[PDB]
Amino acid sequence: GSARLKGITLRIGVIESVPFTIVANVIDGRNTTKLTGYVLDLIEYLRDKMGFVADVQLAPPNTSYTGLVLALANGDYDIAIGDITVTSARREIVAFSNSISDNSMRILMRKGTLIDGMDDLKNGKIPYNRIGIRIGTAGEDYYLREISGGSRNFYPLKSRQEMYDSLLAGIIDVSFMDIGTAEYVTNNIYCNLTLVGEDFDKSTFGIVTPKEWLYAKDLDVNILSLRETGILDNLKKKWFQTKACP
Amino acid sequence: GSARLKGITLRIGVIESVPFTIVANVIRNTTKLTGYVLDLIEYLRDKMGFVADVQLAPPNTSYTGLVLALANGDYDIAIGDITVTSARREIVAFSNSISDNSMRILMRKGTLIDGMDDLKNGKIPYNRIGIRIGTAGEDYYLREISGGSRNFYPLKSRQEMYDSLLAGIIDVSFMDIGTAEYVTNNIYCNLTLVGEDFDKSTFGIVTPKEWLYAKDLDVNILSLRETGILDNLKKKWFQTKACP
Ligand SMILES: N[C@@H](Cc1ccccc1)C(=O)O
Numbered sequence A: 001g002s003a004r005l006k007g008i009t010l011r012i013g014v015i016e017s018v019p020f021t022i023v024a025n026v027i028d029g030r031n032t033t034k035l036t037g038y039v040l041d042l043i044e045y046l047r048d049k050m051g052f053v054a055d056v057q058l059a060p061p062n063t064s065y066t067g068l069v070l071a072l073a074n075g076d077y078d079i080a081i082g083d084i085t086v087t088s089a090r091r092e093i094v095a096f097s098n099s100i101s102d103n104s105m106r107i108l109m110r111k112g113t114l115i116d117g118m119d120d121l122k123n124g125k126i127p128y129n130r131i132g133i134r135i136g137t138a139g140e141d142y143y144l145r146e147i148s149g150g151s152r153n154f155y156p157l158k159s160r161q162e163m164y165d166s167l168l169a170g171i172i173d174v175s176f177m178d179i180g181t182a183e184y185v186t187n188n189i190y191c192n193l194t195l196v197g198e199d200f201d202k203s204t205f206g207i208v209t210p211k212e213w214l215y216a217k218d219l220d221v222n223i224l225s226l227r228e229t230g231i232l233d234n235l236k237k238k239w240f241q242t243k244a245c246p
Numbered sequence B: 001g002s003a004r005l006k007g008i009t010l011r012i013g014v015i016e017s018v019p020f021t022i023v024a025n026v027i028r029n030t031t032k033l034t035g036y037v038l039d040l041i042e043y044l045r046d047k048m049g050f051v052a053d054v055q056l057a058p059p060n061t062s063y064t065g066l067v068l069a070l071a072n073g074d075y076d077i078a079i080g081d082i083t084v085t086s087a088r089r090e091i092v093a094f095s096n097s098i099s100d101n102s103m104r105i106l107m108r109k110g111t112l113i114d115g116m117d118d119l120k121n122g123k124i125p126y127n128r129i130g131i132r133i134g135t136a137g138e139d140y141y142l143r144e145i146s147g148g149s150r151n152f153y154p155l156k157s158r159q160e161m162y163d164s165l166l167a168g169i170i171d172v173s174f175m176d177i178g179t180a181e182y183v184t185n186n187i188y189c190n191l192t193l194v195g196e197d198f199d200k201s202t203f204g205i206v207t208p209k210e211w212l213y214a215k216d217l218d219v220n221i222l223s224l225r226e227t228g229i230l231d232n233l234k235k236k237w238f239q240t241k242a243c244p
């Protein structure tokens, strides 16, 4: 069957990833967290349009994207919204909404690094333990399928912060990120970093839902309507069209 | 519940649209089909083990008409350059995306159009804007240009669109970018695309709502993406440029 989400409480899993989901520690005299970003704005549009009660739950620190999907499949959340890549392995265990965004990956490196693209990584110009890969992500899947043939011979990373510190501290030479956030970091957060080469792994982001979900149609119709009316485009411009770096 | 498509017969609706689904007449007449869509069917059939009963939609069937026919049970799935839209999703489901999409404005070379704003500002008499009925282009026009008014020059087939542009009966039309690039680079060398692309969207395989086999088809589509087969197919069918 199918039904409307009007009146329904949804526990919505979100995962820290600037500027999709931005976590601010604030004291207001008690310490609390404030969430903002593209994802929280999207949640507000959907809530206002669909009438569900949003119960937004931030995934614990160092939760992987795979861990978030597994947690939903196990019943810890009703839906999960973020920069979450739709993959065949995930689709085996959860469903996804219509796409909220196209996606691809790029190679991130320190400026001045003598790398010109993916060919250098595939030909072994960089030792493999100096390629940083965020575990439990689509980038790990790609690496294992296309670069290393199954072997996790990369340098593992648990958060964007560890990627930052490792690259800057010269522990790794490159890493992989989704293009939207990769552009964002190199343009606003770490000006010493840059993107190199062509993008790869063309893909999409989707809202994660349970398989065979009662509310699949209601969510999909609404997401498509936001796509059609330019709301998703506006949110992308709002949160991603910025460059603080000189 | 859910299940696998192995050994199951699927009636697969396809719709003429070069070079997704290419229709040739051969002779005692018979029809041959080739294209991106037919190759995709073969890859999915080989991976999934279903039995494919491929059925071409009657001439001048619109895209809305194909979707409606599937909702009415004439087909089990429909595969083509079929735009995923909110209105269609009310009555059918869609597989994971097989491709990104957008639209562009199609015109004769030499026509002085900057882009969509000219159309929105009334630079072009509305009966000289050709719109293929029962397509996402009509939906866009009604929503963004004419305020719900069907005041365009209605087109029933891709051929009527070309004929009308070439004969000077209309000044512009809308087409999906993949097929638009194909026709302007290979078939009608005196036509061209102009302006920014608009109506960013996706193509998806049409399935019944709440379909038993939804996961099986989706996992398999995503697998074809991941392993580069969809890219290979796009390269095969769309990278040609015969026009000088
Ligand atoms: N989109 C990736 C997660 C990711 C986000 C940002 C940077 C790198 C990886 C996934 O779903 O696995």
Ligand SMILES: N[C@@H](Cc1ccccc1)C(=O)O
Binding pocket: B017, B063, B064, B081, B082, B083, B084, B132, B134, B135, B136, B137, B174, B175, B176, B179
């Ligand atoms: N993709 C359009 C149909 C179309 C195909 C090719 C060119 C123009 C329009 C739809 O689904 O409505």
Ligand SMILES: [Cl-]
Binding pocket: A098, A099, B084, B096, B097, B202, B204
């Ligand atoms: Cl989609």
Ligand SMILES: [Cl-]
Binding pocket: A094, A095, A210, A211, A212, B214, B215
């Ligand atoms: Cl499912």
Ligand SMILES: [Cl-]
Binding pocket: A086, A098, A099, A204, A206, B096, B097
């Ligand atoms: Cl998708």
Ligand SMILES: [Cl-]
Binding pocket: A002, A216, A217, B092, B093, B209, B210
């Ligand atoms: Cl449905």
